[PDB]
C-alpha cells in the first residue's frame with residue numbers, strides 16, 4: 001500500500017504538508033515505489049514527506065493526503 005486509488009493516487013515526495021491537505025515542493029520518486037516503508041524511506045532520504053497527490057508530476061503545490069500510517 002503506496003497510495004489509494006482515485007483522487008489521491010500519485011506518490012510524491014514533498015517538502016511540506018500544509019494543513020494535512022497540501023503538498024509543497026513536490027518531487028517525483030527517483031525509484032519505483034513498491035511499499036509504504038520504501039515510500040517513507042525514499043522521501044525521507046530527500047528531506048521530504050511521502051504524500052499521495054492529485055497529479056503525478058513535480059510541482060510547486062498540490063492537493064495531497066499523507067501516506068497511510070504517517
Ligand SMILES: [Mn+2]
Pocket residue numbers: 024025060
Ligand atoms: Mn516552492
